[PDB]
Amino acid sequence: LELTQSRVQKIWVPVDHRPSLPRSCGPNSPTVIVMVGLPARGKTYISKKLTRYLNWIGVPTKVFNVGEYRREAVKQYSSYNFFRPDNEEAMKVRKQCALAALRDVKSYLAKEGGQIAVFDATNTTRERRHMILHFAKENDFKAFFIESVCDDPTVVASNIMEVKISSPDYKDCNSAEAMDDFMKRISCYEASYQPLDPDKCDRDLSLIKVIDVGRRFLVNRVQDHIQSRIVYYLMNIHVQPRTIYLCRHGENEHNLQGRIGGDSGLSSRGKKFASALSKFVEEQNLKDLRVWTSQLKSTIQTAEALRLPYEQWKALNEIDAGVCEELTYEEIRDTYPEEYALREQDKYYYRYPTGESYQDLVQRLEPVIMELERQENVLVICHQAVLRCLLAYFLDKSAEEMPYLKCPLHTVLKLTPVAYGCRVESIYLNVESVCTHRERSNPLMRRNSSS
Ligand SMILES: Nc1ncnc2c1ncn2[C@@H]1O[C@H](COP(=O)(O)OP(=O)(O)O)[C@@H](O)[C@H]1O
Ligand SMILES: O=C(O)CN(CCN(CC(=O)O)CC(=O)O)CC(=O)O
Ligand SMILES: O=P(O)(O)OC[C@H]1O[C@](O)(CO)[C@@H](O)[C@@H]1O
């Protein structure tokens, strides 16, 4: 009824004329994701990637890798002898690392505003899982288990070569000895390994068992929307290497005039870029390459130069500047001084009047990210703000830094899988253009001076 519209996010909220003594309160039960499985089964890979995705869509998540606690408490690894089930002391130290991590999990979800905590450890015995469940119950946390099962020696071997040998645990080993040591290490866990049994012993646990690197899944009792989204995500990512290229439309006429938004066409240089891009793509020599564009002219003209089939996504259209569309930043500053200042102070959350914020962009791009995960080689031709958002996802950049990432015209960002993340290579196609990047740029108000 009598509402007021927040200046930054433009959200209508009830006016709350605070009383003489305003009161606060202080400030959707948080969840503990329990990874399960033998070493070299992708638990850490899954932990980091899912966390990258959840934080990007706005769900504060953090990984608690018990291995890092262990490496912190023991300083330098020597051999798998540390992981022998008959190693009483180590068993004690490992359990203490687990409890220390849970201690931090508790502090994260109950005191730091965290919503999802990913507990990354083997948790291969029913007893250890029972303990974690107890910890969850007593703290009012939900528990969701993600078990990765892989009986393909080729996959295990490959996993060891990709992230284990170059691990700091093996800084003093060559590949062969590191490989040999890790296999012995894995065998240490095999005797006591009790996989999740949803059809019996674990009938009441909320879980997903990932099998054969995502070929088959067993899902038991999803409890809410967050677990729902987690399962959807897990079931649509794969590990086969591929390449994602990101770039903007070639320079357009509005760029030349310093005007934002709009649907202008390529400038003469933008067209030169489009040709260069075709030459670039050709040289990458990719068997298959999917091309995606927004539904705005400039990206489409750019794709036409490639002589390849392309698909238009309205979701890739540039951020909508609302009433500031078609204006120059100078005209925005002069015509809407307050809006200009508000955006400068909170570029990620700020929403243009009748328009969007980077936050809105992210929500809009969720489907693009999910489909990108399903794809192989793909080239996305988009716009500045959109590219920053997609780049933030791939490079795990925060919301605060997202609106300022540098994504220049006529430059391809080549992303490739490396270990637990993505490597980025910048390739400028040598065609001039303007620069659309803009960095982050009192006295009288104090005396003297659900599921
Ligand atoms: N569902 C999966 N099954 C088997 N390997 C996987 C899976 N998902 C990812 N990987 C691979 O596992 C590696 C990362 O393993 P890591 O996460 O360190 O294993 P762990 O944490 O279980 O010891 C990567 O090479 C990745 O390709
Ligand atoms: O150490 C890591 O980076 C992740 N670990 C998970 C935790 N480590 C703890 C440790 O290495 O001390 C294994 C475990 O939980 O027993 C992967 C694995 O070996 O399963
Ligand atoms: O988020 P930023 O830095 O204001 O840039 C947004 C602008 O970038 C552009 O793509 C111009 O380069 C505009 O169409 C859009 O409004």
Side-chain angles (χ1 to χ4, degrees), residues 7-8 10 260 323-324 327-347 350-353 404 438-441:
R7 291 212 291 161
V8 180
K10 306 295 185 295
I260 71 166
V323 303
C324 296
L327 274 47
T328 59
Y329 289 100
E330 148 249 5
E331 302 173 317
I332 293 176
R333 191 206 52 223
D334 303 332
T335 307
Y336 303 92
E338 206 173 286
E339 290 305 310
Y340 188 92
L342 289 162
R343 190 164 194 263
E344 268 193 349
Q345 92 173 54
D346 204 351
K347 199 176 182 185
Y350 170 90
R351 168 176 302 169
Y352 275 107
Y404 299 100
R438 336 214 311 148
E439 306 295 2
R440 314 191 176 203
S441 327

Side-chain angles (χ1 to χ4, degrees), residues 46-282:
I46 296 168
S47 298
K48 290 174 178 291
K49 181 152 179 162
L50 179 66
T51 296
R52 186 153 62 69
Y53 173 75
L54 292 173
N55 280 131
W56 184 75
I57 66 169
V59 179
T61 305
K62 184 174 176 182
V63 173
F64 293 85
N65 182 170
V66 183
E68 289 172 4
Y69 283 72
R70 188 261 300 164
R71 279 188 287 286
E72 181 62 52
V74 180
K75 293 85 164 188
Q76 183 56 221
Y77 181 79
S78 58
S79 80
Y80 71 93
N81 279 286
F82 180 79
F83 296 95
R84 283 165 56 173
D86 68 343
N87 189 332
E88 194 171 272
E89 210 187 19
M91 283 299 280
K92 181 202 272 190
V93 172
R94 291 168 59 201
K95 184 171 188 182
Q96 278 161 8
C97 285
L99 296 174
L102 287 175
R103 180 170 312 142
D104 290 358
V105 163
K106 183 184 175 173
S107 169
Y108 178 66
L109 301 177
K111 302 188 170 63
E112 299 167 34
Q115 167 67 33
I116 305 281
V118 182
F119 192 63
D120 179 17
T122 53
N123 300 310
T124 47
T125 65
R126 288 172 184 175
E127 158 267 317
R128 177 51 53 74
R129 293 191 295 265
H130 174 79
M131 176 194 86
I132 295 177
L133 235 19
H134 176 83
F135 159 86
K137 177 80 67 183
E138 78 186 4
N139 283 291
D140 247 79
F141 298 159
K142 287 183 181 175
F144 183 69
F145 300 72
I146 297 179
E147 178 173 30
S148 168
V149 178
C150 178
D151 299 314
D152 186 333
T154 298
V155 174
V156 175
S158 175
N159 295 175
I160 291 168
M161 294 307 293
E162 185 181 313
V163 299
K164 305 297 174 188
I165 59 181
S166 62
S167 158
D169 279 337
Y170 296 93
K171 59 175 79 167
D172 293 314
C173 292
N174 53 58
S175 305
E177 51 204 5
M179 167 65 83
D180 178 80
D181 181 85
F182 206 87
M183 291 306 288
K184 293 184 190 302
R185 184 165 154 178
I186 289 160
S187 70
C188 287
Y189 296 79
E190 284 166 342
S192 55
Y193 177 30
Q194 301 172 289
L196 301 179
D197 185 17
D199 304 317
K200 319 177 197 300
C201 165
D202 307 302
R203 272 186 311 88
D204 298 348
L205 301 187
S206 294
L207 63 97
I208 179 173
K209 179 190 291 276
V210 182
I211 306 162
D212 300 308
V213 203
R215 194 84 49 187
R216 183 187 298 119
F217 305 81
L218 209 162
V219 179
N220 194 242
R221 49 184 54 187
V222 169
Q223 310 170 61
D224 53 26
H225 72 275
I226 204 61
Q227 288 174 17
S228 179
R229 296 290 301 270
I230 285 172
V231 166
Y232 180 44
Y233 186 74
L234 294 180
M235 300 179 70
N236 286 285
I237 56 172
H238 62 275
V239 304
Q240 297 57 36
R242 46 81 171 264
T243 300
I244 291 171
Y245 304 84
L246 303 177
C247 78
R248 295 164 66 183
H249 46 82
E251 177 186 68
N252 60 38
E253 317 248 59
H254 269 33
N255 296 321
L256 289 174
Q257 306 167 268
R259 289 181 180 292
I260 71 166
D263 192 10
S264 69
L266 292 186
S267 67
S268 57
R269 292 150 137 189
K271 305 189 189 182
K272 289 192 186 70
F273 167 65
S275 296
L277 182 61
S278 180
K279 187 191 184 193
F280 176 71
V281 169
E282 199 170 77

Side-chain angles (χ1 to χ4, degrees), residues 386-439:
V386 169
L387 185 23
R388 283 174 174 152
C389 293
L390 302 172
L391 195 65
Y393 167 76
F394 288 109
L395 268 16
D396 189 34
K397 298 300 191 171
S398 70
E400 187 183 332
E401 46 190 0
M402 183 184 301
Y404 299 100
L405 298 177
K406 221 165 291 185
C407 301
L409 281 172
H410 304 351
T411 308
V412 181
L413 298 185
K414 181 178 179 180
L415 302 167
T416 56
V418 46
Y420 293 122
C422 294
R423 169 201 173 189
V424 59
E425 305 172 47
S426 181
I427 307 99
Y428 174 50
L429 307 199
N430 197 37
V431 178
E432 279 296 354
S433 73
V434 297
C435 175
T436 53
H437 191 266
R438 336 214 311 148
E439 306 295 2

